[PDB]
Design an enzyme around this catalytic site. Structure first.
Site, mmCIF file in Angstrom:
data_model
loop_
_atom_site.group_PDB
_atom_site.id
_atom_site.type_symbol
_atom_site.label_atom_id
_atom_site.label_comp_id
_atom_site.label_asym_id
_atom_site.label_seq_id
_atom_site.Cartn_x
_atom_site.Cartn_y
_atom_site.Cartn_z
ATOM 1 N N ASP A 1 -5.087 7.414 15.444
ATOM 2 C CA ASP A 1 -5.372 7.102 14.041
ATOM 3 C C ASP A 1 -5.980 5.741 13.913
ATOM 4 O O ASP A 1 -5.681 5.000 12.975
ATOM 5 C CB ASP A 1 -4.129 7.319 13.136
ATOM 6 C CG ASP A 1 -4.431 7.481 11.633
ATOM 7 O OD1 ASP A 1 -5.568 7.855 11.288
ATOM 8 O OD2 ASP A 1 -3.525 7.229 10.818
ATOM 9 N N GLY B 1 0.783 -1.227 0.000
ATOM 10 C CA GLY B 1 0.000 0.000 0.000
ATOM 11 C C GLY B 1 0.818 1.281 0.000
ATOM 12 O O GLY B 1 2.055 1.258 0.064
ATOM 13 N N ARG B 2 0.101 2.417 -0.087
ATOM 14 C CA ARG B 2 0.627 3.779 -0.102
ATOM 15 C C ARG B 2 -0.167 4.628 0.887
ATOM 16 O O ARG B 2 -1.386 4.458 1.022
ATOM 17 C CB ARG B 2 0.511 4.379 -1.508
ATOM 18 C CG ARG B 2 1.815 4.365 -2.285
ATOM 19 C CD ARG B 2 1.665 5.050 -3.634
ATOM 20 N NE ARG B 2 2.966 5.347 -4.243
ATOM 21 C CZ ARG B 2 3.131 5.993 -5.394
ATOM 22 N NH1 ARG B 2 2.076 6.417 -6.084
ATOM 23 N NH2 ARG B 2 4.349 6.218 -5.867
ATOM 24 N N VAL C 1 4.457 1.133 2.043
ATOM 25 C CA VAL C 1 4.645 -0.132 2.765
ATOM 26 C C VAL C 1 4.879 -1.307 1.793
ATOM 27 O O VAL C 1 4.170 -1.443 0.791
ATOM 28 C CB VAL C 1 3.512 -0.394 3.773
ATOM 29 C CG1 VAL C 1 3.809 -1.599 4.657
ATOM 30 C CG2 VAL C 1 3.255 0.846 4.628
#
Ligand SMILES: Clc1cc(C[NH2+]CCc2ccc[nH]2)ccc1-c1ccccc1
EC number: 2.7.11.1
Length: 327
Positions: free
Chosen positions: A155, A45-46, A52
Site C-alpha cells: 500500500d 485523518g480518516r 487516526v
C-alpha cells in the site's frame, strides 16, 4: 496449463527459514494495555480501515499517534500487529509504542511514536530535485528493510508516507495491508490504491512479491518529478491498466501476459486498444524540468516495468546514479 509460477529475486526464503512464531500471525498473542494513559487531541485523518488521532501520553506529556481500528476482522488486526512488532525499530518504519483498548468501547487501538506532518500542498511547491532524491532514498531504506524481513507493504502511496520536513524525518505508515511473503503463495490482488496498483494486480496475477512495492514507488516518483498527480489516472481497475498501457504501450503488455501465461479478463477486449511505447522525455514541461534529469528518467524507467521480475529491487534502486548526491 494455467499461469506460469514466479518467486521474488531477493529475500525469497526469509520466512521459510524462520520459526512459525515469526510469520504465523493467527497464533500471535496480543496483549491489550489500558487506553487511560492517552488523551486524544485532534483528528489527523480518516481511512477505510481506521481513524487516526494526534494524542498525548499523560504519564510523560509526550505526543503520540493513535490509530482507532474499525474492528472488521480479527485475523487482519493480528496481522498488522505482528508485522508492526516484527519491524519495530527498522529504519523509517512507524514505531508501534502500545496496543490498547478503551475500557468501555473495547475498540482496538494502536499507539505510535509521534510524527509531525508538514503541510503537503505547501511542501509540494517548495520541494527541490535534491529533496525528491533525499526522500525517495528514505522510503527505499524502509522498503529494503521490510522486504529483508519477509514483508511486502502492498500500500505504498503518498498518504502512507509521513514527512516532517523541518527535521528531514520520513516514516512509512499504515501496515494494515502488509503481508508475509512466502514463495509460491497466491495472494489477493485487491490491495493498494487504484493509482498505485501494479500491472500484476490489474491482470489478476496472484503470485506477486516485494516488487509490487517497487511499481507503487515508481508511480510516486513519476508524479513528483513530472508534477502530475496521479501519474496513471484510471477511473476503475480495468481503466487503470489502459492508462498504464497508454505510456508503456501494448506490445510489452502482451509480452508480459505471454511470459507468465496470464489470461486477460474479457473486460479488457473493448478498452485496451493499441498503444505505442512513449518516451519518458515527453512528460517534461516548463513547470517540471527543474526536477527532471537523465538519471531520474533512467531510474524511473527501471521501476515502471510490466514485468515484476525486471523491476529494480529496493537494494539495486539504492545503488542507482540518481542517489549519488544523497549517499
Ligand atoms: Cl511520499 C510523500 C508524502 C507527503 C506527505 N503525505 C503525508 C500523508 C499523511 C498525512 C496524514 C496521514 N498521512 C509529501 C511528499 C511526499 C514525497 C516526497 C518526496 C518524494 C516522493 C514523495
Amino acid at each position: 496449463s494455467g499461469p506460469v509460477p514466479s518467486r521474488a529475486r531477493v529475500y525469497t526464503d526469509v520466512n521459510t527459514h524462520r520459526p512459525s512464531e515469526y510469520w504465523d500471525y493467527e497464533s500471535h498473542v496480543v496483549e491489550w494495555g489500558n487506553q487511560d494513559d492517552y488523551q486524544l487531541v485532534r483528528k489527523l485523518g480518516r481511512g477505510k480501515y481506521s481513524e487516526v488521532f494526534e494524542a498525548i501520553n499523560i504519564t510523560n506529556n509526550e505526543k503520540v499517534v493513535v490509530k482507532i481500528l474499525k474492528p472488521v476482522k480479527k485475523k487482519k488486526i493480528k496481522r498488522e500487529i505482528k508485522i508492526l512488532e516484527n519491524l519495530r525499530g527498522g529504519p523509517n518504519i512507524i514505531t508501534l509504542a502500545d496496543i490498547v483498548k478503551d475500557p468501555v468501547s473495547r475498540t482496538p487501538a494502536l499507539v505510535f511514536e509521534h510524527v509531525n506532518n508538514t503541510d503537503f500542498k505547501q511542501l509540494y511547491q517548495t520541494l527541490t530535485d535534491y529533496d525528491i532524491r533525499f526522500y525517495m532514498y528514505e522510503i527505499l531504506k524502509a522498503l529494503d528493510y521490510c522486504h529483508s524481513m519477509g514483508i511486502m507493504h502492498r500500500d505504498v502511496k503518498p498518504h502512507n508516507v509521513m514527512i516532517d520536513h523541518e527535521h528531514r524525518k520520513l516514516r512509512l505508515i499504515d501496515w494494515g495491508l502488509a503481508e508475509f511473503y512466502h514463495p509460491g503463495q497466491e495472494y489477493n490482488v485487491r490491495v493498494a490504491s487504484r493509482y498505485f496498483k501494479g500491472p500484476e494486480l490489474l491482470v489478476d496475477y496472484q503470485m506477486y512479491d516485494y516488487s509490487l512495492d517497487m511499481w507503487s514507488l515508481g508511480c510516486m516518483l513519476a508524479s513528483m518529478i513530472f508534477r502530475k498527480e496521479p501519474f496513471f489516472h484510471g477511473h476503475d481497475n480495468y481503466d487503470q491498466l489502459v492508462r498504464i498501457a497508454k505510456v508503456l504501450g501494448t506490445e510489452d503488455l502482451y509480452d508480459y501476459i505471454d511470459k507468465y501465461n496470464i489470461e486477460l479478463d474479457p473486460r479488457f477486449n473493448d478498452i485496451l486498444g493499441r498503444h505505442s511505447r512513449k518516451r519518458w522525455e515527453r512528460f517534461v514541461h516548463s513547470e517540471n524540468q527543474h526536477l527532471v534529469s537523465p538519471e531520474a528518467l533512467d531510474f524511473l524507467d527501471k521501476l515502471l516495468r510490466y514485468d515484476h521480475q525486471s523491476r529494480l529491487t529496493a537494494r539495486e534502486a539504492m545503488e542507482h546514479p540518481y542517489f549519488y548526491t544523497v549517499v
